[PDB]
Amino acid sequence: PPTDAPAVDTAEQVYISSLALLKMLKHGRAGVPMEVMGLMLGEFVDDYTVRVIDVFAMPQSGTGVSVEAVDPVFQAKMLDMLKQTGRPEMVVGWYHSHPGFGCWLSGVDINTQQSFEALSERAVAVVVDPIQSVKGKVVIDAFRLINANMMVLGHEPRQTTSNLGHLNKPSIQALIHGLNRHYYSITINYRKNELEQKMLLNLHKKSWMEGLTLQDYSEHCKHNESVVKEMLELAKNYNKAVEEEDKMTPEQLAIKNVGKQDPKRHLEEHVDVLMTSNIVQCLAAMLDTVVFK
Amino acid sequence: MPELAVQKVVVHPLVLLSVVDHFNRIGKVGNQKRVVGVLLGSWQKKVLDVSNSFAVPFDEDDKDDSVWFLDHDYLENMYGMFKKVNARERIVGWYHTGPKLHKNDIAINELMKRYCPNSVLVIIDVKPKDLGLPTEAYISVEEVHDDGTPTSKTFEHVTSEIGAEEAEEVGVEHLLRDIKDTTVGTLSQRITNQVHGLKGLNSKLLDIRSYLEKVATGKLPINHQIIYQLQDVFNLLPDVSLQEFVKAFYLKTNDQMVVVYLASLIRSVVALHNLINNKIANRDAEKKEGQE
Amino acid sequence: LIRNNNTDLMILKNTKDAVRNSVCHTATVIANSFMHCGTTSDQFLRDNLEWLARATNWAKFTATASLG
C-alpha cells in the first residue's frame, strides 16, 4: 500500500444513561407478546463509544415488528419536535425486546438492521429482555451485523474488531453464525451520575411515618397473643425433635423434609418478627413521651 | 379535593429521572429557571399514577409575572404522538421544577386545564437536599372565606409519594448497587425510620418558628388563618391527662418486656443447642482426623 | 546476548504453527519480541513473510515494534 488500508478494529461499547435504560425496560415490557421497538437518540463520541442519551418508542401494527407502522414520517416529525425542546440529537441505533428467551437476532431481525446499515453506517441494535432481566443484572446486550460476504471471501478471520470479552452460550443457537457470521457482541456500560443517584435513592417520606406514629395498642396485643401461642405449639414438637435427632444418623435428619413445622427454623422465624416488633414496639412509645412532651 | 377523586399522587422513578434530565436539556445559560412539562398517566380512584412526561418549550420573564409562554400547540401535537404509541395515556397534570411555588403558577394551571379537569402540579426538585420526598402535589381548587374576600384560585396540598412497577423496581435496583442499602437488616432499618423521622419534625417545626418570628418582627402582614390552626396544635399536645396516662403507659410497657423476655430466652436456648451440635460434630471429626 | 543464544527455535515453530488464529497472531509475534531480546535476530521475519501480510491493522503496529 502507498496509503492506509480500510480499518475497523475497535472495542465498541455503549453507554446507556440511567435515564434511557428505565425507558427501554418499561416500554419494552409493555409488549410481552408482540415485542416493541424504538429509536435511540444520543451522540457518538470519537469512534470507540456510542452514547445513547435517550430513546423513544415507535408505533407498530398488530401482528409484530412491522416496518409499515415504522413510518419515516413518524421519526421525522418526532425529530423536529425534539429539536424544539433542546435535544440536538441524531439516530444512533434501534432497540427491541425478545422477551422470555435469549438475546439474539432473528432472520427478520438481522435483515431489518441491514436497513439501518444502508441509511447509516453506525448502528447498534440493542436488546432488552423485560422478563428474564427481572431483578439483578438486567439482561441487555448489543449487536452489530457483520459483512457475511467479506467473510466468505477470506476476511472471515478479519471480522475480529478488538473487543474485550466475557463469553455467552444460550444464544449459540444463532450466535454461532451470529457472533461468528452475522453480527457480534458489543459490551454494555452505564454512567451513574451523582444527581440521578441522589434522586432515585429517595423512596420514603418519613416525617409522618414511624417514630411520629405507632400501631394501635389493641391491634398490638392481638398480635402478641397469636404468636406467643404458636410458640407453644412449636415448642412441643421441638422436644419431640430433640429426642429423635439424638437416636439417628445425619442422613435421616438430612432428608427430613416432611413437616418443616417441627424444627428450630420456625422458632427463629418467629422470635425475630416478635422481637422486632416489639422492641421497637417498645422505643416508639418512650421516644414520643419526650419528643412531644 | 373535597371530591374523593384525588389524594395519592404516585410518581414512578423514570419520571423523576425524566424531569431531572429535562432540567439539563434546557440547561445552557437558560438554567436557573422554572422548566415545565406535562404529566401523562392513568388513574381510577383516589390516585393519579404518573408515568410519562415530556418537556414543553416554556419561557417566563425574570421580574414580571404576566409574561409567560407555553407552546400549547406543541402539546396538542405530542400528546397525540405518544397516544399513537400507548393507549390509556391521558394528561393527568403537569410538573414545574420548583424550587417552590410562584404566583404565576395558577395562570399555567388554566392553560393546562383546557385539556383535563383535575390537573395537578407536581413540584419536583433539581437539587437533592430535602430529607422527605422531592415530590409535592398540589391541586387548583377554589373556596370562600369567613373574612368575606372574593373567591380565589388557591393551591391545596395532597399527600404524595413514589411507587413502582417490576420494570421500574428492577432498573432502580440495578442503579443502586453502588450505594448499597440492603446490608442493613430489619430492626436497624426501623430504628433508622424513627431517628430520620425526628429529622423531619425538627425542620418542619423549625420552619413554623421562622415564620412566626417573621410576622412578629420584620413585619409581614398577619394571616389570621395560620395562627388559628397554630392554636389547635397547642391544644392537641398530650398533656392534661398526665397522672392516669402515666400509670397506664407503664403497664403496657411491662407487658412488652414480658414478651421480650420470653423471646430472648427461647433464642438463647436454641442457639445453645446449636453449640451442642457443633461440639458433637467436632468429637466425631476428631475420630476421623486420626485413623490412618 | 549475540554470542550465546542458548534457546531452541524449534519450540516457537510449534507455537507459531498451532495458533495463528485471530489475536494469537499478535501473541506469537511478541513471544519472539522476548525470546530474541537483544540477540538481534530477525529470522522469524526474513524467512516467514506470510504472517506480516496476514497481519491485521495493529499486528502491523506490533510487527514493526518487535524490531525495536
Residues found in chain B: 292
Contact A162 C22 (CB under 8 A): no
Buried b (16+ CB within 10 A) or exposed e, A77-93: ebbebbeebbbebebbb
DSSP code of B26? S
Contact C57 A157 (CB under 8 A): no
How far from the centroid of its chain's Cα atoms is residue A98's Cα? 14
Find out whether A228 and A270 touch, Cβ atoms under 8 Å: no
Instruction: Give the whole-angstrom CA distance, residue B174 versus residue B124.
Output: 23
Closest CA to B171 of B4, B12, B11: B12
Buried b (16+ CB within 10 A) or exposed e, A24-35: bbbbbbbbeeeb
Which long-range contacts (C-beta less than 8 Å, at least 24 apart) are formed by B164-167? B164/B12, B164/B13, B165/A26, B165/B12, B166/A29, B166/A134, B167/A22, B167/A25, B167/A26, B167/A29, B167/A130
Strand partners, A55: A40
Contact C22 A160 (CB under 8 A): yes
- Calculate the alpha carbon distances from B107 to A132, B74, B79, B140 in Å: 47, 18, 21, 10
Sheet order of strands, A37-45 included: A183-185, A140-145, A124-128, A90-97, A37-45, A49-57, A13-16, A187-188
The helices-and-strands tally (H runs, E runs) of chain C is 4, 0
Q: Could you tell me the three cell numbers for A245?
A: 435427632
Instruction: Give the whole-angstrom CA distance, residue A109 versus residue A102.
Output: 13
Strand partners, B38: B54, B94
Rounded to a whole number, what is the distance in angstroms from the first to the last CA of chain B? 84
- Calculate the alpha carbon distances from B201 to A76, B123, C20 in Å: 52, 21, 71
Contact A228 B262 (CB under 8 A): yes
Closest CA to C15 of C2, C5, C7, C25: C25
Find out whether A158 and A146 touch, Cβ atoms under 8 Å: no
- Contacts with B126 (C-beta within 8 Å, 6 or more apart), sequence order: B19, B20, B23, B97, B98, B99
Q: Could you tell me the three cell numbers for B230?
A: 397554630
Instruction: Give the whole-angstrom CA distance, residue A155 versus residue A161.
Output: 12
Please give the resolution of this entry in Å, rounded to 1 decimal: 3.9
Pairing of strands B36-42, B90-96: antiparallel
C21 interface with A at CB cutoff 8 Å: yes
For residue B205, give the chain A residue with the closest CA.
A207
Find out whether A162 and A60 touch, Cβ atoms under 8 Å: no
Q: Could you tell me the three cell numbers for B144?
A: 370562600
Residues found in chain C: 68
Instruction: Give the whole-angstrom CA distance, residue A96 versus residue A25.
Output: 10
Contact B81 A190 (CB under 8 A): no
Chains near C with 3+ CB pairs less than 8 A apart are A
Among partner residues B71, B166, B175, which is closest to A200 by beta-carbon distance?
B175
Find out whether B187 and B175 touch, Cβ atoms under 8 Å: no
How far from the centroid of its chain's Cα atoms is residue C36's Cα? 9
Q: Tell me which amino acid residue B258 is.
A: V
Closest CA to B51 of A22, C21, A115: A22
Instruction: Give the whole-angstrom CA distance, residue B109 versus residue A233.
Output: 62
Buried b (16+ CB within 10 A) or exposed e, A38-48: bbbbbeeeeee
Whether there are 3 or more C-beta pairs closer than 8 Å between B and C is: no
Q: Determine the 3-state secondary structure of C46 from DSSP.
A: helix
- Contacts with B58 (C-beta within 8 Å, 6 or more apart), sequence order: B34, B35, B36, B68, B69, B70, B71
Q: Determine the 3-state secondary structure of B271 from DSSP.
A: helix
Q: Which of A16, A24, A26 has the highest number of chain B CBs within 10 A, making it the mutation to test binding with B?
A: A26
Q: Chain B closest CA to A49's CA: distance in Å?
A: 21
Backbone φ, ψ for residue A83 (5° rounding): -65, -40
Q: Cα A221–A226–A227 angle (5° rounding)?
A: 100
Q: Could you tell me the three cell numbers for B223?
A: 394571616
B248 interface with A at CB cutoff 8 Å: no
Closest CA to B264 of A268, C49, A155: A268
Chain A residues near residue B169 by CB distance under 8 angstroms: 135
Chain A residues near residue B199 by CB distance under 8 angstroms: 207
Q: Could you tell me the three cell numbers for B113?
A: 386545564
Q: Determine the 3-state secondary structure of B39 from DSSP.
A: strand
Find out whether A112 and A70 touch, Cβ atoms under 8 Å: no
Instruction: Give the whole-angstrom CA distance, residue B256 versus residue B156.
Output: 41
Q: Which three-class secondary structure string do you get for B51-63?
A: EEEEECCEEECCC
Backbone φ, ψ for residue B37 (5° rounding): -135, 175
Residues found in chain A: 293
Q: Could you tell me the three cell numbers for B13?
A: 422513578
Q: Could you tell me the three cell numbers for A194?
A: 451523582
A32 interface with B at CB cutoff 8 Å: no
Instruction: Give the whole-angstrom CA distance, residue A216 versus residue B65.
Output: 49
A133 interface with B at CB cutoff 8 Å: yes
Q: Tell me which amino acid residue A128 is.
A: V
Q: Could you tell me the three cell numbers for A275?
A: 422481637
Q: Tell me which amino acid residue A270 is.
A: H
Contact C56 A9 (CB under 8 A): yes
CA dihedral A164, A167, A171, A176 (to 10 degrees): 80
B71 CB-side CA count, 13 A: 16
